[PDB]
Amino acid sequence: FNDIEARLAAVLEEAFEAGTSIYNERGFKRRIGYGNRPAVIHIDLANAWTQPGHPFSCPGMETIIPNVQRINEAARAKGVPVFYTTNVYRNRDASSGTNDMGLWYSKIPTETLPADSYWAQIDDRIAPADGEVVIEKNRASAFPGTNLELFLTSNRIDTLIVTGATAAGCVRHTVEDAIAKGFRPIIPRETIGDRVPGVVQWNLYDIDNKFGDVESTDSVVQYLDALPQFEDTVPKTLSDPQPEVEAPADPV
Amino acid sequence: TFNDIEARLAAVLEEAFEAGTSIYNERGFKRRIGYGNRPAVIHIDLANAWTQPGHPFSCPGMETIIPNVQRINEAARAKGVPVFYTTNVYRNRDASSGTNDMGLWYSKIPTETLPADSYWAQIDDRIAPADGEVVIEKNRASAFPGTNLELFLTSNRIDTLIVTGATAAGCVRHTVEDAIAKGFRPIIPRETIGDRVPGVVQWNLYDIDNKFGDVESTDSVVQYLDALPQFEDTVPKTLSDPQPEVEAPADPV
Amino acid sequence: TFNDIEARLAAVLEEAFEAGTSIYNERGFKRRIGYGNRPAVIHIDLANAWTQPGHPFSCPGMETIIPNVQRINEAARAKGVPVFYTTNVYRNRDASSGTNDMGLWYSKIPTETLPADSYWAQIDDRIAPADGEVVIEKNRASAFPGTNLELFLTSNRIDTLIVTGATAAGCVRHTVEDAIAKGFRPIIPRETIGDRVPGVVQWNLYDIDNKFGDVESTDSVVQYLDALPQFEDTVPKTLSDPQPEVEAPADPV
Amino acid sequence: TFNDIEARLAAVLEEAFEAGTSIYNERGFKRRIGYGNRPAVIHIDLANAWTQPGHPFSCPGMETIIPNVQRINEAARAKGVPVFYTTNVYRNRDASSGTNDMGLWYSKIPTETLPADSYWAQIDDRIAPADGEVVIEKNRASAFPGTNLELFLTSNRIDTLIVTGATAAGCVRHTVEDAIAKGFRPIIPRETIGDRVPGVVQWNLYDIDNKFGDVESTDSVVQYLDALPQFEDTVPKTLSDPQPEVEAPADPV
């Protein structure tokens, strides 16, 4: 419900159809596929995003969190690694040489996200279980400045299930980084949120076209339900075979 | 795409951008990063596979992108500004091989069609690199993963990165997100950005301007470059530009 | 008993050092990187597991190290210079776990003896972090992998990294060479470097000075920081200092 | 150097190593990382500047190193193992240019003597790359900064990296410690490691075996590769091998 959103949703679907035909003819929008040794990462489902009243609050939590709980419940039944990020700063004074906001402060209100405040805590409804990692990050993607890639590479993870907020911010930069670094991104659609119109729709479409597969939470839970116990999983060593299109030859 | 779809899409997207801009501004997003004092220009994939027709990566609109890229190059070269070019090409395109360089991007887009050293891999002749400009062969969307770009930028104290090229919903956006994260101010000259399906340039330049960099006109970029001292004399801005600060909400208990 | 091994090894290592230095000088290695203009100080792992006796990682010589480290801190905080501290600690020491953060360094050194938030993990009281100084919990030898150190150094345009701490044969060397590679001039104050077995401090400092940073006295570093402007007014040297250049050997064909 | 020093040096260094190993042993260091199941080989700078006499980077001992590198290569090529080669060369060697790729390493070693595409940049003929093998041009000591090596190793799930090459006191050590940090088990065939001044090979291989990788004989490495399944069929070891765990000390208060 909203004045614009019904029309925006309807016309964005038409634009999406059009684009999918061009993409499909050219051989884009291929399926990356689920791998065998997954990790789950919840991007910034901390109070500043899940609770109302912060500059970073996202609506839709009433639908995101139950779906996040279904995934957590499936994953921790197999001992799958679960990571959470909270985007917070220890030194919010942009004139100091030890400030950790860098240039993102020149774009978004980083000074409103103090480390170890209520706003920095992962939301109670999905509190971290024992052995799950909470990573405090300083930039949008969960990779820069954190140790997420040291866990994922050292422990041979091949699939990264990404959930969280926002589609137009931290989720997309994380997914883009993951496929480039070497991890298969699966995005469970109902767990992604944002705070302005259209951005969830068009960012998930862009992600599904070139960076990760956007799936239903039901698909993701069913996949985790069919997993062996994590300690017995082995990664897929190369990409899944694709219907290859042929490289055009030099015109001269 | 039928013109009724194009027409109605521009209209609803404008409604969405108006609405979104108000929310962002109210909350303190969409601030201006601003030009720094010691820039580099990088042209993302304005190589024949994107600029010429007949390849699966071909982007339309080059007729508008190329003369504007040239305006930037002319202003930059005049000042001795570093200009980098990238081309997204692969030395070993067999997904079954242990030294294939396509990795998992082959499971999403047709990377097998981009051979290194072919016609398609060369930079477009209309904007041919000048002596001393760097051409980087890259394997992933952003210009940073697996390349030496960040070594140039950090070791030579570059504070601003003018990003041009293709595509808005692919390589240009991931390069901009990486650059601001790493510490370089991204300025996107709006007219030098291309793509190949409806809506994507508009909504991706909207998202970039809101959280990752300042979308500007090529006119503004050229005026900035024209006002620079010679690159030899530029020194970088050492911290962020001061911002209108939003106050952190106090904890309810 | 008594075996004069320390003095015997120092005398013959000095003979090796004279020989190597002649070769390096002739070939044009061992050049001075020189101090830049906008410095940061990083103290590597001077936490209780290294500075206090009783832990598998304890280093002797802290009585010489800590006062020199304190001299640099006192000189740095007088100028508003950024000071960073690392502590190498782990939050999940169960190598069977998928969320263990020790990776493969557990197959070489006893990582499971370093718990985060224990006494052992705490920076030594004699050099307690002052307000605004950063404590980085790291998981690998160099202070860069898996941390946000590079984000501070690149975003705040730092050009010089003064490195102190433990050990010459572990964490200090890998940090120093990662620093010059990424673009930060490493200066090592000799007297603040420690280790726990013979020879390693000497030969690792020699190797660093030859190809990766300048090994100086703490006196020179304190004097550099004392002659510095306030940090807010410093700006980085934009390129390398000119070197006496050696000519490339001509190709046979 | 003086041969009397070479022999004195070898003998006294053995005393220092013996003593050091006793201490590492009483602390639980120097554990074995072990061979994994899915390896790649990397030859660090066995290019003409290092292998052939007459360059400032020339190394002695190639008559021993190269037959041993050839044995590894023959074994690897039989199983289809990925073999990578690096060469350390520069496209723009003018330190005052904003697009020079030498960075600050030029302020330490003579990087201006290493042109890309020169005779000196070529991989030595005796160990010439076979088709499918990758030659990586790199700009800094470790083979990881500014290159796509990590893209190959992570995307293709390599767990072990066999490192050969020049020098022990430079590019080989930085590459090995980067590798264990990133998540790849480093194996060093002792006979294939070279350098140009006294003692460095000995003390750098000691330091590496203590904390960063396993120094093995070439026979050991060849036996491993000969026992391997065909590369296409190998799967990586997903976590560390179990280690003899040392007791984490309790906090004194």
UniProtKB/Swiss-Prot annotation, chain A:
Instruction: Relay the cofactor remark from the entry.
Output: Binds 1 sulfate ion per subunit.
EC number(s) reported in the record? 3.5.1.59
Which GO BP terms, alphabetically? creatinine catabolic process
Region (Disordered) residue ranges read 233-252
Tell me yes or no: is Hydrolase among this UniProt entry's keywords: yes
Q: Which InterPro entries match?
A: Isochorismatase-like_dom, Isochorismatase-like_hydrls, Isochorismatase-like_sf
Arranged from A to Z, the UniProt key words for this protein are: Hydrolase
Report which reactions are catalysed by this protein.
N-carbamoylsarcosine + H2O + 2 H(+) = sarcosine + NH4(+) + CO2
State whether keyword tRNA-binding applies: no
Cofactor(s) recorded in Swiss-Prot or TrEMBL: sulfate
Which Gene3D superfamilies does the entry link to?
Isochorismatase-like (3.40.50.850)
Q: Which Pfam families match?
A: Isochorismatase
Q: Where is the active site?
A: C170 (nucleophile)
Q: Which GO MF terms are attached to this record?
A: N-carbamoylsarcosine amidase activity
Q: In which pathway does it act?
A: Amine and polyamine degradation; creatinine degradation; sarcosine from creatinine: step 3/3
Q: What CDD domains does the record point to?
A: CSHase
The lineage's top-level taxon is Bacteria
Name this polypeptide is given: N-carbamoylsarcosine amidase
Q: Which organism is it from?
A: Arthrobacter sp
